[PDB]
Design a protein around this ligand. Structure first.
Ligand SMILES: CC[N+](CC)(CC)Cc1ccccc1
Ligand SMILES: [Mg+2]
Ligand SMILES: [Mg+2]
Ligand SMILES: [Mg+2]
Length: 340
């Protein structure tokens, strides 16, 4: 039963959940990978990993992905959650040097992941393993685009480190721009392509309806995370959340801010529904009778279908995952699954 303040009847009625058939194997394989890569302690893996639902989140999103693609994506996504936790802990403990060094190593590993498979920092080694595997599916031009996007993501995390150390809450537009990077909008969008087996040409993926559908799917993910993760984040002195920007700068109350975030989330859904029609029309137009046209049409259609699936996967993940269950923790500021 979703809390009333978080419930979205449109998602529940009109965005039916999907689950990839590889999910049962995926859950165990990513748990084993977190253990083998030492990304979490063994006892915390055993107690918490399945309950975190990270594999479920990806298996509800990249429908149709080959199993090996989904495995690499799921391992990368679990890594990404552990990195968010590492970042948080470095901020809380004032580890500016450790963060700066990790930031530099991730930029280097992202360009040369094979070189870093056995790095002393298991967080760097786990990143490099997942990225090397993601770089094995499509041409180097796709890999270069993934890297360009993730270099930008690393720098947004650096900006968050400085905001939280200086106590700066970004303004609303500043925040919204930053949040397209800390959510990694363009990484998840890039990953649609190995999932459907096709690197899309710039003229296809930059088509206005493809771009706007992709944007709105990720804005939903970001802002619905903000709505659901607000309690854990207030408890943990996190400053990055649309609700916090609204409270801090527009003098809204917590109740007013939650309402405004919810309204922005709801409008994202119905803006998506409008553009989804145009993006599927474009998929139709690509099927011009040629072999290449059929390939591009089917890839666009699968990708736009997964942009839709992200809404239901994100919605349910926030109510199933132990990541956000702050009421269940003895110390609300220290989630039991992080390394403190
Ligand atoms: C792994 C995803 N992420 C940011 C990229 C890491 C903390 C948080 C997130 C979870 C769910 C929806 C949106 C963002
Ligand atoms: Mg976080
Ligand atoms: Mg974060
Ligand atoms: Mg959050």
């Amino acid at each position: 039963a979703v809390p009333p303040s978080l419930r979205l009847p449109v998602i529940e009625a009109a965005f039916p959940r999907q689950l990839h058939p590889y999910w049962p194997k995926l859950q165990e394989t990513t748990r084993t990978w977190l253990l083998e890569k030492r990304l979490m302690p063994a006892d915390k893996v055993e107690e918490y990993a399945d309950g975190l639902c990270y594999t479920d989140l990806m298996a509800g999103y990249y429908l149709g992905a080959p199993d090996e693609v989904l495995q690499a994506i799921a391992d990368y996504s679990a890594w990404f959650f552990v990195w968010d936790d590492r970042h948080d802990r470095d901020i809380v403990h004032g580890r500016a040097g450790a963060w700066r060094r990790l930031r530099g190593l991730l930029h280097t590993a992202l360009d040369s992941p094979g070189d870093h498979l056995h790095h002393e920092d298991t967080l760097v080694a786990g990143f490099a393993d997942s990225v090397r595997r993601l770089y094995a599916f499509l041409p180097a031009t796709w890999n270069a685009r993934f890297a360009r996007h993730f270099h930008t993501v690393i720098e947004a995390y650096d900006r968050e480190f400085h905001n939280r150390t200086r106590g700066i809450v970004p303004g609303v537009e500043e925040y919204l721009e930053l949040r397209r990077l800390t959510t990694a909008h363009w990484i998840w969008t890039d990953l649609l392509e190995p999932s459907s087996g096709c690197e899309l040409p710039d003229a296809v993926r930059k088509h206005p309806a493809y771009r706007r559908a992709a944007l709105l799917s990720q804005e939903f993910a970001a802002w619905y995370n903000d709505l659901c993760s607000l309690p854990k984040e207030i408890a943990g002195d996190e400053v990055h959340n649309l609700g916090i920007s609204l409270i801090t700068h527009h003098s809204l109350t917590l109740e007013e801010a939650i309402g405004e975030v919810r309204r922005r989330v709801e409008e994202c859904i119905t803006e998506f529904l409008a553009v989804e029609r145009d993006a599927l029309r474009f998929a139709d137009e690509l099927a011009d009778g040629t072999v290449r046209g059929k390939e591009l049409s089917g890839a666009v259609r699968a990708n736009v279908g997964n942009m839709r699936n992200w809404f239901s996967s994100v919605y349910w993940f926030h109510h199933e995952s132990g990541r956000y269950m702050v009421d269940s923790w003895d110390d609300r500021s220290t989630p039991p699954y992080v390394n403190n």
